[PDB]
Design a binder for this molecule. Structure first.
Ligand code: HEM
Length: 142
């Protein structure tokens, strides 16, 4: 249950991000590594000491999952099976549920750099509710 006005703030903001999803994704992950640098060694070439996802491929996959959430922002329930399963995949490779707040922060930081004054209080609140619903779905696997 997200109403039209808030759904539209998400859809509009997401169109701005979707002009350049790898460039915005690199901003999300640059912030995430600043907050939680222990996550870098899960990526190919992310380790001091050298199956692992490659960094830009995984960004594409991340932005494709957010795209699906944005497409279903009014009701996320067609997605709960996938998200439950995606949460389990992440848990199994050592990504704690605690990292959900770090990804959240990093997502809000990427949106704020993409949108400037168009990142309105209501846009921020709507994206937090959307992200929270996604993490809730995923945390039935974490
Ligand atoms: C701390 C944050 C994250 C880390 C460290 C991370 C890391 C990884 C790792 C290691 C894999 C490979 C797992 C495996 O082979 O089973 C993976 C797969 C994936 N990640 Fe992430 N991920 C993170 C966040 C996200 C988020 C927030 C999304 C989407 C909202 C996402 C989307 C995906 C997708 C679609 C895959 C492919 C799943 C599959 O192999 O079936 N990731 N990620």
């Amino acid at each position: 249950h997200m109403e039209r006005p808030e759904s539209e703030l998400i859809r509009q903001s997401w169109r701005v991000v979707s002009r350049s999803p790898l460039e915005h994704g690199t901003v999300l992950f640059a912030r995430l590594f600043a907050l939680e640098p222990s996550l870098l060694p899960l990526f190919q070439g992310g380790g001091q000491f050298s199956s692992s996802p490659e960094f830009l491929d995984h960004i594409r996959k991340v932005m494709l999952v957010i795209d699906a959430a944005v497409t279903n922002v009014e009701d996320l329930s067609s997605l709960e099976e996938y998200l439950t399963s995606l949460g389990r995949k992440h848990r199994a490779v050592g990504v704690r549920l605690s990292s959900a707040s770090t990804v959240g922060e990093s997502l809000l930081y990427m949106l704020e750099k993409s949108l400037g004054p168009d990142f309105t209080p209501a846009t921020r609140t709507a994206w937090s509710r959307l992200y929270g619903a996604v993490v809730q779905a995923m945390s039935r696997g974490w």
